[PDB]
Amino acid sequence: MRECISIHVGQAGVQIGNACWELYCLEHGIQPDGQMPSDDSFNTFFSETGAGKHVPRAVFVDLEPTVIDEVRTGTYRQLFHPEQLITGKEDAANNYARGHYTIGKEIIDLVLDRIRKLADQCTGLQGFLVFHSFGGGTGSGFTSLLMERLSVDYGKKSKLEFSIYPAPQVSTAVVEPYNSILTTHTTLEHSDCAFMVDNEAIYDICRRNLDIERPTYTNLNRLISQIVSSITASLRFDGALNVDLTEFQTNLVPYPRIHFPLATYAPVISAEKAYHEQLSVAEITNACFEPANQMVKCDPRHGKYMACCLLYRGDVVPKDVNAAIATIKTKRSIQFVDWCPTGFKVGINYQPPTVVPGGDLAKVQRAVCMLSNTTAIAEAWARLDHKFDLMYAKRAFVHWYVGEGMEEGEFSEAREDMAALEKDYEEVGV
Amino acid sequence: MRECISIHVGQAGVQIGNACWELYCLEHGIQPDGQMPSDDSFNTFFSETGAGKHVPRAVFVDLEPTVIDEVRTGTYRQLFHPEQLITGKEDAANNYARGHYTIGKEIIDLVLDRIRKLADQCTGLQGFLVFHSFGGGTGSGFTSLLMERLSVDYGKKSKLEFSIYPAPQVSTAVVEPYNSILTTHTTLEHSDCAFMVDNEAIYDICRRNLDIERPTYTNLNRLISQIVSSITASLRFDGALNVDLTEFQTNLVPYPRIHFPLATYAPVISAEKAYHEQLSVAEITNACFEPANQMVKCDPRHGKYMACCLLYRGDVVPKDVNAAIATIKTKRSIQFVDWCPTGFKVGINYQPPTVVPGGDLAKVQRAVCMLSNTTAIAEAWARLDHKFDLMYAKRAFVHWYVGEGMEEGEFSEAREDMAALEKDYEEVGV
Amino acid sequence: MREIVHIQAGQCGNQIGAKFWEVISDEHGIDPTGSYHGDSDLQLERINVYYNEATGNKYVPRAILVDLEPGTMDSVRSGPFGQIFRPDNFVFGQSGAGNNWAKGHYTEGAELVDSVLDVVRKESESCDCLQGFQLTHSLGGGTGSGMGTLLISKIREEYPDRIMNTFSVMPSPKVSDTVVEPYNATLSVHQLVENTDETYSIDNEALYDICFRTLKLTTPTYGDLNHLVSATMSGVTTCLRFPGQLNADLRKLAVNMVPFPRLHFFMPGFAPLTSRGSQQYRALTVPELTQQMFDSKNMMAACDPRHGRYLTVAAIFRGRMSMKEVDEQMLNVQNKNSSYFVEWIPNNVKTAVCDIPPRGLKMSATFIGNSTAIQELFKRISEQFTAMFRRKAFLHWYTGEGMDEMEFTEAESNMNDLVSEYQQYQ
Amino acid sequence: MREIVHIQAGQCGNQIGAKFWEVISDEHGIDPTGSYHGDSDLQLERINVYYNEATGNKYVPRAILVDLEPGTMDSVRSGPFGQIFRPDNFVFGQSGAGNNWAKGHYTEGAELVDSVLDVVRKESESCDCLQGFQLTHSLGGGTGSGMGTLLISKIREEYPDRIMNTFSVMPSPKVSDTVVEPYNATLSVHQLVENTDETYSIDNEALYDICFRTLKLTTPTYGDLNHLVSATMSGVTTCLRFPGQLNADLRKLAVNMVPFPRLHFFMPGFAPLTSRGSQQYRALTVPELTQQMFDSKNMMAACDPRHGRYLTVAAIFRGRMSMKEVDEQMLNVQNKNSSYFVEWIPNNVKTAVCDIPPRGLKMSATFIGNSTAIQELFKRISEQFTAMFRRKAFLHWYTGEGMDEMEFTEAESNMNDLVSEYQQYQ
Ligand SMILES: CC(=O)O[C@H]1C(=O)[C@@]2(C)[C@H]([C@H](OC(=O)c3ccccc3)[C@]3(O)C[C@H](OC(=O)[C@H](O)[C@@H](NC(=O)c4ccccc4)c4ccccc4)C(C)=C1C3(C)C)[C@]1(OC(C)=O)CO[C@@H]1C[C@@H]2O
Ligand SMILES: CC(=O)O[C@H]1C(=O)[C@@]2(C)[C@H]([C@H](OC(=O)c3ccccc3)[C@]3(O)C[C@H](OC(=O)[C@H](O)[C@@H](NC(=O)c4ccccc4)c4ccccc4)C(C)=C1C3(C)C)[C@]1(OC(C)=O)CO[C@@H]1C[C@@H]2O
Ligand SMILES: Nc1nc2c(ncn2[C@@H]2O[C@H](COP(=O)(O)OP(=O)(O)OP(=O)(O)O)[C@@H](O)[C@H]2O)c(=O)[nH]1
Ligand SMILES: Nc1nc2c(ncn2[C@@H]2O[C@H](COP(=O)(O)OP(=O)(O)OP(=O)(O)O)[C@@H](O)[C@H]2O)c(=O)[nH]1
Numbered sequence A, B: 001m002r003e004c005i006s007i008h009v010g011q012a013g014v015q016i017g018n019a020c021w022e023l024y025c026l027e028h029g030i031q032p033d034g035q036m037p038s039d040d041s042f043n044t045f046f047s048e049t050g051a052g053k054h055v056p057r058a059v060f061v062d063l064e065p066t067v068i069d070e071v072r073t074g075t076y077r078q079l080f081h082p083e084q085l086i087t088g089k090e091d092a093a094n095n096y097a098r099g100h101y102t103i104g105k106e107i108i109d110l111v112l113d114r115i116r117k118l119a120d121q122c123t124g125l126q127g128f129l130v131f132h133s134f135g136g137g138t139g140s141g142f143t144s145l146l147m148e149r150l151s152v153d154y155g156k157k158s159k160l161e162f163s164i165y166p167a168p169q170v171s172t173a174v175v176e177p178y179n180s181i182l183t184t185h186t187t188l189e190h191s192d193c194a195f196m197v198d199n200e201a202i203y204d205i206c207r208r209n210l211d212i213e214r215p216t217y218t219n220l221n222r223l224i225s226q227i228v229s230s231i232t233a234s235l236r237f238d239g240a241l242n243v244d245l246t247e248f249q250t251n252l253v254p255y256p257r258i259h260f261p262l263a264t265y266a267p268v269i270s271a272e273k274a275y276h277e278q279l280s281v282a283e284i285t286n287a288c289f290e291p292a293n294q295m296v297k298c299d300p301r302h303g304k305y306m307a308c309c310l311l312y313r314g315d316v317v318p319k320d321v322n323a324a325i326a327t328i329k330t331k332r333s334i335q336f337v338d339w340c341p342t343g344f345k346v347g348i349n350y351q352p353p354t355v356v357p358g359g360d361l362a363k364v365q366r367a368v369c370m371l372s373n374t375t376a377i378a379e380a381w382a383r384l385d386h387k388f389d390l391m392y393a394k395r396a397f398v399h400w401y402v403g404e405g406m407e408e409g410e411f412s413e414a415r416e417d418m419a420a421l422e423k424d425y426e427e428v429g430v
Numbered sequence C, D: 001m002r003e004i005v006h007i008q009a010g011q012c013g014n015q016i017g018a019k020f021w022e023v024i025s026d027e028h029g030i031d032p033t034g035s036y037h038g039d040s041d042l043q044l045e046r047i048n049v050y051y052n053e054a055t056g057n058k059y060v061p062r063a064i065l066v067d068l069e070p071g072t073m074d075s076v077r078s079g080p081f082g083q084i085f086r087p088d089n090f091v092f093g094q095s096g097a098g099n100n101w102a103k104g105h106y107t108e109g110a111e112l113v114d115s116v117l118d119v120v121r122k123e124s125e126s127c128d129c130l131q132g133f134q135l136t137h138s139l140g141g142g143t144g145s146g147m148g149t150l151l152i153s154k155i156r157e158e159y160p161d162r163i164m165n166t167f168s169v170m171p172s173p174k175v176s177d178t179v180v181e182p183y184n185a186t187l188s189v190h191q192l193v194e195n196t197d198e199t200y201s202i203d204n205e206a207l208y209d210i211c212f213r214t215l216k217l218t219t220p221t222y223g224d225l226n227h228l229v230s231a232t233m234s235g236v237t238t239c240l241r242f243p244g245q246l247n248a249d250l251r252k253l254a255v256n257m258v259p260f261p262r263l264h265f266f267m268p269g270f271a272p273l274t275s276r277g278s279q280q281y282r283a284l285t286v287p288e289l290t291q292q293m294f295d296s297k298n299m300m301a302a303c304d305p306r307h308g309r310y311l312t313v314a315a316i317f318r319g320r321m322s323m324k325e326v327d328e329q330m331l332n333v334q335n336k337n338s339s340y341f342v343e344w345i346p347n348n349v350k351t352a353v354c355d356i357p358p359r360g361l362k363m364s365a366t367f368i369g370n371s372t373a374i375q376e377l378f379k380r381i382s383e384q385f386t387a388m389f390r391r392k393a394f395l396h397w398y399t400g401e402g403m404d405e406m407e408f409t410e411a412e413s414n415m416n417d418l419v420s421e422y423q424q425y426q
């Protein structure tokens, strides 16, 4: 019942998985060895065997072994099914071309084989939680090949998309927009609701809120895990208003192509800071709409809200939710599209947030998960399109994509598709 | 209910805050850590969290960090919300110019942000208690920038002004009148009732009454705190005649521009001196009108009283107040304007004054707070205007103000405005 | 697993490669006799990248030592780590090349290319998954420049898909030790551009500039220049021998670093670099590593980057550090110095970070740069070639080997073509 | 946080700056090796103002040592605190200036200005929030007066907004040790007035007068004059390195102390000053500090303030004192001596108080004064210049360096202009 198969592609995907399962084993009380010391709250994410062992339903796919066989050496080496974590021989070279045609071709058939052997025990499979990065070669090419076959083998099943998106300023590779643009066909055609992750915005989040001067990506991971667990909170624990994963995405999505909502989490706050605040429902409600708390470097005040979903968890009373949202609709600075004078979807869960012992996040009795679609997010693509022009105008690095079996015009279809998406997110704002 | 947001700008403002909160935590019985060992008498000044902690609603703003990060090291480092005490990078250089256009520009937006996050928990916000110094660069420029935006974001809310005013003889900087004159537009347009503080007059007070030969500014602070607490006494404790903060300023103000009353406190007396006097209500009433007890070096006998407010606290019977004020109106040496044959506003509070353990003030069962507007105070500006001429006649230090983005004619508007104020306080005396 | 097969050409190549072998044997904790002596298991998983597993848990490097003289083989086998090498890969002639490119490419090295190919092929078949060939040689003289290009062409012909990265020490005007270097350099880069996927240009003069003006050595010998080369030698391949947060193997660099196929002669560099009496005072923080890294003094060629524009730069960091400051310096460098980086391509930097720093170092940074200013050495080599080309000196010692004038003309034309492309995008 | 970057020019400048470094290293409790050894944390928070944090919790001062001879560098590095300095900031030539301003400003120092600029820029970028540059030099001779003005002009050009304060020991008639000083002083103040926001004039004769007639030293050496300079050196920047009730950094002084932009040559002084056998008897109370402070004997130039009017005076007090007596003396001095202070500007004093007194002192007072009487040294320098200008001596040793007569004429005209402005408001 209510099972979800999590897919982890690329270095970013596999390591964000390492952090997510680190959070899940703690919140559901499983040791790193898979045992339960002493409700079926784990059936959503973990499978059970006769010996009392919790086996996650997850696949780690990387075209290179270093990160995954590092996982084979870490504390979670025995938690995972060893041959459901698949390693390739040749890295993706930050190239969508080989990852989509050349190197992922020989390995994808085993990946779908393991997906099938994960699906056949799920009696109530709810959806898919695939993790990757746009800029990475694996996270672009292999995901592009994989959602294609998943959409024809599991077409009815929902496919939530949690992807890591490049920053306006911070970047790790010059070819990142090339990998990002050929991913856009996958999210538009073979995804049901995509969640985009910006590293620089959350860098600002941890700089300002967590007061930590020197966090790593592991600190980024130990909050992406919270956002995904909060999205999955209603499926695993009891709540006064439990939101089904299908109910969720029906509430987000106004049109089949408009399914790209922003995400924010509250309260992101350090342990030294949690003490001096009462941390009411109202202020965590007010903090979410603050542009200084957005996960993507775009100003919501530059845009218009279409769908709003209040995913509260912990000791939160729905009356306080109504009182907060009355204030939210009271201010004019937050102007919603003329589509939704009802505005808000409310979801409340009884489980307080679970704290990572090595994390930088404080223990708070209340936590809220904010997921909202808005027209302001097109700016996060409005710099990437001008960016892609700035390379494609000479055919900057295409000889590699051409040399690995990509048609030259696939870039033309790519920027045509992103232009279509950018237009689609502008007409709905009128 | 009945909350007031206190603003502290400049070195003088932040340190007078350090003394005021030192007095408030003692009188309301809060430890320096914010806890209550064991009525909602603290709701006027302190906010409460779930863990039983009292958090003041105050902002320390200084364009330089030394005094505030000294507060971050003092005994009250944990009492205050650390990022509601805002520090800049560049000092104000005793210059209104940079403080009003250049250096305070980048920091004021955070200051109003924190003011908003202090306003949103105040359910019954009564007014603002901003502290600064006229002569200081920060206390002039940043306050001038701040009341401008507060008057448009909190226009209805009262804004009491407690400012430290230069002496006729004692001075610490040559540019002090320059900073003081550009402050006059703020008090006239963006203040509701300003309270002016002279260091030399209160130097004479502590020399004569406290018998202390060698006090510091901390002794000045441990009586400015008493005057402000006595003004706020009715809002926090019970009294037979409690005077609302709006009631107070309605009783002070005859005209929108005549809102500049003097202040005196009685009984200012040393511990060795408290023993030999019975200290009746009459003598503390008589001591307040004595020019040797005025807070500003101006002779009230040189001027005419318009509004009189008797803010008694402690074991005082209102009959004795009436008996005292009958004697006050009996003598001719105290001549009130033909506006107010009713003369006196009476306010009585049941809380005796709270003594600082390290202070130089005696413990007295009775205390009275004297606030009165009079035409004699124009002399405190009648030497500052002739003073400002004595510098502006060559353009003495204007190249700095010009060099930091001030219009040269802003001095012309400044002395035109002070001349208008000086005239306004003379016609009403006829 | 991504095995990498090393080839040494010329005395310069084999001695600097031998010192590289010494360095990475210390990094992997390999005894001079070949046995393992490292401390952590991290030195052990990717031994297959550079060494072959043998009986007794001893490890033999996958290196092919090629020369036309036995004296250099005698010195290297008698060197500090001579005993660890394969006796079979000591493939060598007897008569030297005499700094003659034609000798090495037609007569002296053509007879030994058969004896080097049967060794490189067996080394490659000994690999589980070959990634490429790292070849060390010198553009000066006729051994390293001469036979090196021939066997590079052969291995490229029979291995068309594997990565081809070469580290080339190349001639210079003021520290020239041989008269006939420019002929050798022009006849070598002709094949280097057409065949190699990667070429690192190393100039001796800037190595000297590093050891005096940064390292403050009074007598830095030739081995110190070898050390400076070997630092980046080990740095460029760090990601596929050790775990790190951002893994970037050779082809990861390649896909990010060479915008057009022929623009693959690059700028190596390494940080930190201090004198003996100044390391005690330096703060080794990553921002300081960066400010040292893009300095024109830290580079290993005379081509000053301020005379051109960077096409792509690769900064493979190493050590237990976070990375937001990494991004902030990598954007600040290209923002405040945007006039030194091609504005038309926005993010010129590839960032890689490794988790285990070098032994004795808390952190390290390896610099790889694509600047249009690298044409300074190419056009100067072409000009010096013209000063000894236009009216026929020294050609009897090439034409006597079957070499011909028109091939010299095409080599010069190709140098001019290269400098044309690299000035085109400046 | 308000970092301040120090530059030493000339032997006078670098030795007095070195002794200043010694003094404030003792104040901050810094070991000769550079490690911290202070007692309270108060010495530790504002270490960033003068020193750079490095590995091992040792601290290197932000000083750039500039000279045209290696002998002074040899002496300073072998001095008591030579080891704490940066080996890189020892930037120096070999041939000296020979007390020639033209040499330092055109030939000898122009080649080294590139090597000083790349160091001062790296020092400035190492700072978190730069406040200004404190530069020590001598108006005598051609090194300190010559290259000092050139590099001051350069740093002013590229740092237009930062505070520029210079402490200048300047020539004098009766204790003159070099023939050609007046040329140097006239060619130096020309740039000092136009570029510097702040200049402290120091005269050696009044230092001698202090050490005999107040300190009662029988043999006060040159280091004692350096000590007298360094006392005010440390005093003027006390407020931004330590807490005090009245904080007054350099720009706090500036906004209060220089009424018109060009009236920025000022009068330093320090109190208390006693002989060894008289400190036992003195009452160090603040009023006595004041009566000592405005004495004409306490000052460090021959310009007697009774021959002019004070424009602005700065009294940065230090120690655990109250301040009503501070105000009462600062008003009594300007009231009972109102004939010595410009009555047209009423409150001529800027008052600053620090909470931590100097080590071994319960309290201290630092004197900074703007008097129209400071023109005594300027007009006397102009007169001595005229006695060696009007009919052409020594000009061949300047004109041989590319120097020209008309620039000497403009320099003299500018000295006359300055003395005109300072006599105008007297
Ligand atoms: C006590 C102390 O801290 O001294 C350090 C050191 O950090 C200094 C002095 C070292 C030192 O290096 C040199 O003296 C040197 C001389 C000529 C050419 C190159 C280096 C050091 O020898 C080098 C050595 O570095 C390593 O061990 C690295 O792993 C390096 N391997 C070698 O240098 C090496 C030396 C002998 C045999 C085999 C290898 C390395 C660098 C990049 C990639 C792989 C390996 C270290 C930490 C030191 C000493 C010992 C003084 C420096 O070396 C490196 C490569 O980091 C020179 O500048 C750097 C940084 C420092 O100034
Ligand atoms: C036993 C005793 O009370 O002697 C005192 C002292 O007060 C006297 C003798 C000191 C003493 O100074 C001298 O003898 C001296 C000689 C030549 C030039 C200048 C000073 C003293 O050396 C100086 C020293 O002062 C300090 O330590 C200050 O912090 C000073 N630093 C130094 O003088 C210093 C000395 C060596 C190495 C590094 C610094 C300082 C002043 C201003 C700003 C920063 C630092 C003190 C208290 C004394 C002695 C030891 C005798 C005096 O010095 C100062 C600067 O206050 C000279 O006149 C003053 C006051 C006193 O007469
Ligand atoms: N937020 C976040 N982003 C990450 C993390 N790890 C990798 N990324 C993103 O991944 C992008 C680059 O992709 P890669 O590092 O190459 O990972 P990959 O998806 O496996 O791609 P390949 O290595 O080519 O196979 C970077 O721009 C990062 O934004 C992480 O831990 N947190
Ligand atoms: N009564 C009293 N006045 C004070 C106190 N502290 C400072 N002042 C006044 O402040 C005036 C000078 O302002 P500053 O000391 O520069 O303080 P500031 O307002 O922060 O101004 P800046 O330093 O330029 O930012 C003096 O003339 C004093 O009258 C105090 O503790 N008590």
Ligand SMILES: Nc1nc2c(ncn2[C@@H]2O[C@H](COP(=O)(O)OP(=O)(O)O)[C@@H](O)[C@H]2O)c(=O)[nH]1
Residues within 6 Å of the ligand: C009, C010, C011, C012, C013, C015, C097, C098, C099, C100, C138, C139, C140, C141, C142, C143, C144, C145, C169, C176, C177, C178, C203, C204, C207, C222, C223, C225, C226
């Ligand atoms: N950087 C460096 N350069 C060297 C070294 N040894 C020699 N060289 C120079 O590099 C050039 C290469 O020429 P060389 O290798 O002798 O020609 P070959 O014999 O035909 O291979 C020579 O002219 C030397 O001056 C070394 O150890 N390091």
Ligand SMILES: Nc1nc2c(ncn2[C@@H]2O[C@H](COP(=O)(O)OP(=O)(O)O)[C@@H](O)[C@H]2O)c(=O)[nH]1
Residues within 6 Å of the ligand: D009, D010, D011, D012, D013, D015, D097, D098, D099, D100, D138, D139, D140, D141, D142, D143, D144, D145, D169, D176, D177, D178, D203, D204, D207, D222, D223, D225, D226
């Ligand atoms: N106050 C003081 N004066 C000095 C000191 N040393 C030298 N002087 C004098 O200051 C003048 C400066 O000239 P100088 O520095 O030698 O010229 P430069 O070599 O071109 O920098 C000299 O004529 C000296 O007489 C010192 O330690 N303190």
Ligand SMILES: [Mg+2]
Residues within 6 Å of the ligand: A010, A011, A012, A062, A064, A092, A136, A137, A138
């Ligand atoms: Mg990858």
Ligand SMILES: [Mg+2]
Residues within 6 Å of the ligand: B010, B011, B012, B062, B064, B092, B136, B137, B138
């Ligand atoms: Mg201030």
